[PDB]
Design a protein around this ligand. Structure first.
Ligand SMILES: Cc1cc2nc3c(=O)[nH]c(=O)nc-3n(C[C@H](O)[C@H](O)[C@H](O)COP(=O)(O)O)c2cc1C
Ligand SMILES: Cc1cc2nc3c(=O)[nH]c(=O)nc-3n(C[C@H](O)[C@H](O)[C@H](O)COP(=O)(O)O)c2cc1C
Ligand SMILES: Cc1cc2nc3c(=O)[nH]c(=O)nc-3n(C[C@H](O)[C@H](O)[C@H](O)COP(=O)(O)O)c2cc1C
Ligand SMILES: Cc1cc2nc3c(=O)[nH]c(=O)nc-3n(C[C@H](O)[C@H](O)[C@H](O)COP(=O)(O)O)c2cc1C
Lengths: 349, 349, 349, 349
């Protein structure tokens, strides 16, 4: 009985040790955030347009100007190897077979260059800045190995207070190593940035630092973790090619608004691509966001449930159900072409 | 203990095999739709008018200009034979004894001409278009056998994702055959529309196609499955004599609005009869809709519970309770004549 | 543990046979009405006024111009004898000891003249009109025996559909007889109004009939069962000295609004005393209504729980707790004199 | 597993006898008040500001013009000795080690002068007026022993109806004595204010009485128990240096609004420090209040859970978690300096 994402979550819960499952499903503090991420979608309902010819439908769409099979992406999630062996490759291959980009996390278990060597799909790289110089190295690595777009996630200045992990004394499984930080120096002055091997990131990274990153990277640049049209607009003003509204899937700040709450506003104010993630499980959630103007939706836990439960095949499976889910929804609301979606198909509840 | 519709649902659940019961009660995906269909009625409460003489009450009303015993109809539901032997006849006979129309489904187990031959009540025919030519045949059949009004349901361009059926591997019971598609050709060119024996309808049927249907049928024409005043108005502009606001009882699109949400607007904009279904269980739900301007309410599952539980007699029983329910409500709110209902008797909550 | 009304309900449920308890606690259809009657009070919260001298408090108040100990009344409830022997007397005596009026029901187990003979408190009479002439007899009886005010309840044109009673085949207990209809004629022409010994009232009683009643009764006249400022205002225009907003404690129309929803409006429009009942259990509910302008609150089930659980003493007990409850609330919100209550002490939620 | 306040409540429930636990956790009547106190915080969510340098954060803040480690205080709670031996000292010492004030209750188990003798932190004194002359004595005592600020709580004109205590026949534990009322007179005329040894306070204390208190005390004066901007403003007009919006943690009036409902208004109207308590458990609740303009938040039950569960160490523990909680929240919303908080970081839900 694997007919939707929730079915995959259930199977994933059965196969993962409790501690790993909690680490994946868990959110910050009371988890009112993850709940809100799901509940916010009920604020909109569909007003389908009847008697529209939907015999020929299209989910094809440009994201940052580049055509892909559907406006979905497998977003950046770290420690995927803890969910399934070579999790990073499995995810990237499923995304490639589906015709959509895959975003590699700075905390991946497979290195930037190894994935590129083993997968020919559209690869994006998600950057966490712990040490500027180290960040510069990874960015150039990604550039030199053909990663098409850079994603700066800015919502982990400090670690989220996830109590499930605290109660389980969650210790990052043995085998899992942060590959991208592998083999890095040890001079005695020419430097002790080695001190920067902590569990905390550079809490000082700011707008000026973004300019630095902007000059460093030549291709499409996105800023992830935004929760206001004002921040999204500033990002564009500073050179970003688009943004990813997100609350990190409820794992950072339990009382953060859902990105869906500032989606329409960010789209109207920035005039640039506004991607989004956090809370997406049903094709309907996805269509609601696209209808409000989102360029694309990034999947977090949805595809991880497929990975955890059945590896690569599970990811392929989750993506085909979601694709068929989206397609079916378009037919039902009378919007044959996904690029024609508009607020017109929605009713605020 | 058979005092209301819910009591009949309970008895029906006891008598039907689980798989058939799930197929009947089930909705699309999370079933937030069927729930919403029920919950929306709580958005209105009654403000009765006291000291009104209600010693003589009338539920009589014209629907599409034709008087009937009460503004209710037994709506189109397919595979009624799966709920009770000769389900279609049982329903039609109960409706006839009650003085209200019965709508035969394109997917009925009794043929268009057989029902007409065995029942003298007001018979309506509900059309699903799978193959144009086949549709034309059924429409002419219905015309020639005395069906008074034609109903085009437009909300099944594609099949609803009903997970209860998927989990039960629901296979349309053996005996049940789609009678109306019986004995149809097999030429080798003069044609393979035989290819059109799938579980999918003509997803291309559009406004132009509606005109075609409009010229084909000479009597009253209604378009069912609408969820916007704009669509309802276009239907009238294209020749329809009225519409049936509906979300197919929550079985097609889980996040569709309830038709009750666009009822008042459709009535004010079209100026033509606006019938409605989806979620009706209590006489109060019915009176609320009539008060908002609905010409009539079509029963879906309510009368099917009566059928499933006690056959024809069960349907008669559900209709007498509902009639007495409506009558009692009119007395209580001080509107002796059902045709005098207005938004004045309601309080938006 | 008898510290509030709910505690008395619990004890009453333990002492009454289930069928009698259901008949008392029950509401119409789904009982969404009784629930709403309780829930509506949460729409207001208190904004107390601090540093006000509340060392000397007063609950004394005029109702229809006549001073009483507190703005409470034990309202009309029929078949009180089914809850406790000589229930009507017990209630009337507790009310008298408390300094508030008691309203005798047309369906009481003790006759109009017997109660007056055995209780010297302020007695009101509640009239149900089944047969005009019979009604005239009771009204004159009440007049001649010293009942101070007449109450016409208008919300039982037809009986409420209470499903608990239907499931229990509730048969009015053996002993209980409708005393006020005792010993009445049997001519053969001079008449068969004997036909009017049914379970249904005069559904034709209207505004003209109210004028008739108005000319018949010389003292204070109140119309009970109103749910709109418009009806309340018409009642005043037709001669009523005040009204009682009420939905009969949720036992008549499950979807009726709570009288609390039209309280402020009725007070502002009529300019006459507006009493109210339906849903009152906590002193806070009572103070909220008084603050919104209600002249007084009638208790229905609250005092019946005291009666059912411990007879007269139980009623005395419920009234002293409620009085102390009200008094304590006045101190806490800083309104020492109950007649100084105003919307100023409330916050709409 | 002691990672947040709720964890300490759980441990406290395990260690305290039920009767003492109920006396601590309990609220007035239905306890809809305490629930509302918690629920109201969900009316706001965070809109963090990204790309802000939060590598250096500050929780330091002035309260009534005096710098302290963070805008928190351990508020006045009586009978602390019933929760842990020498509870008052334990609380005061934990607060002092944390760098924040401690407020001694008039009903403390340790005397005004004994605490001052044993603790050198910032000590505030909370005054309940039962007898004017007795009140004057305590106020002068506090003045002479170095207490920095006086707090008049005005929301106990009468005792709250807490039903948990009534059901448990809660009798103030044996050992616990009201130290501050110790050794006081017994003349025969020069007086029987001895009559004022009841469980009730001076219900007459009013605005004029506040002036009296104002002239008596030379330092900072705060009025606690306010629930309206109008009352808060009057307090300032009468000489108070600030106020403490509060509903006494839901223990006095079950339907009282939460102070959070008049926080912004009180801040805008008075132009003076507006402190607040009632319902605070998560750092997020605290940051929301500060963002709305509160000068500081007083902890009631939160720190008592630490006391009850692990004495002084438990209090130290609750304060370090709360401090780290607040600090983490500031980083996450991008407001490095706690004094820079504004409504800008919130989204009304
Ligand atoms: C186990 C797990 C690991 C994650 N790792 C990262 C990461 O390394 N970098 C990043 O930018 N986001 C990371 N995220 C956040 C995701 O990019 C995404 O914002 C989020 O999961 C979306 O919400 P959803 O899980 O409801 O889809 C992670 C999320 C989860 C659940
Ligand atoms: C078992 C079942 C079969 C149905 N079959 C049909 C059909 O063949 N044609 C059609 O137009 N609607 C069909 N409907 C939808 C109904 O016409 C009606 O819109 C719906 O049931 C109304 O909602 P309700 O079930 O809450 O009353 C069906 C509904 C159910 C529950
Ligand atoms: C058992 C029972 C009997 C009643 N009998 C009468 C009656 O004879 N006449 C009348 O006017 N109202 C009658 N009422 C309605 C009450 O006057 C009153 O409106 C109602 O109970 C108020 O609501 P509450 O029960 O929540 O207080 C009755 C209510 C109950 C629960
Ligand atoms: C057990 C207990 C004792 C209290 N004693 C006092 C007191 O003596 N004086 C006072 O002003 N407030 C007193 N309070 C109220 C507190 O000062 C504070 O307003 C309240 O607890 C804040 O709510 P919270 O408990 O949700 O934090 C008490 C509260 C509790 C729970």
């Amino acid at each position: 009985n694997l007919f939707n994402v929730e079915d995959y979550r259930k199977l994933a819960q059965k196969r993962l040790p409790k501690m790993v499952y909690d680490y994946l499903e868990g959110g910050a503090e009371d988890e009112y955030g993850v709940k809100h991420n799901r509940d916010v979608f009920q604020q909109w309902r569909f007003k389908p347009k009847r008697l529209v010819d939907v015999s020929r439908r299209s989910l094809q769409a440009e994201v940052l100007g580049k055509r892909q099979s559907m406006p979905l992406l497998i977003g950046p999630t770290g420690l995927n190897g803890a969910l399934w062996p070579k999790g990073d490759l499995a995810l990237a291959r499923a995304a490639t077979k589906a015709g959509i980009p895959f975003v590699l996390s700075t905390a991946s278990n497979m290195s930037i260059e190894d994935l590129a060597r083993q997968c020919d799909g559209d690869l994006w790289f998600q950057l966490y800045v712990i040490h500027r110089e180290i960040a510069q190295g990874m960015v150039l690595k990604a550039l030199h190995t053909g990663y098409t777009t850079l994603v700066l996630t800015t919502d982990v200045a400090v670690n989220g207070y996830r109590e499930r992990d605290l109660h389980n004394r969650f210790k990052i499984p043995p085998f899992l190593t942060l590959k991208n930080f592998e083999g890095i120096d040890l001079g005695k002055m020419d430097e002790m940035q080695a001190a920067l091997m902590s569990r905390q990131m550079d809490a000082s990274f700011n707008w000026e630092a973004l300019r630095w990153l902007r000059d460093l990277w030549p291709h499409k640049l996105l800023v992830k973790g935004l929760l206001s049209a004002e921040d999204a607009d500033r990002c564009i003003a500073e050179g970003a090619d688009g943004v990813i509204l997100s609350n990190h899937g409820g794992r950072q700040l339990d009382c953060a608004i859902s990105p869906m709450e500032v989606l329409a506003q960010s789209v109207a104010k920035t005039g640039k691509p506004v991607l989004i993630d956090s809370g997406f499980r049903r094709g309907s959630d996805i269509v609601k966001a696209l209808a409000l103007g989102a360029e694309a939706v990034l999947l977090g836990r949805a595809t991880l449930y497929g990975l955890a439960a059945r590896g690569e095949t599970g990811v392929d499976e989750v993506l085909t159900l979601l694709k068929a889910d989206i397609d079916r929804t378009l037919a039902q609301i009378g919007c044959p072409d996904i690029t024609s979606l508009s607020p017109d198909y929605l009713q605020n509840e």
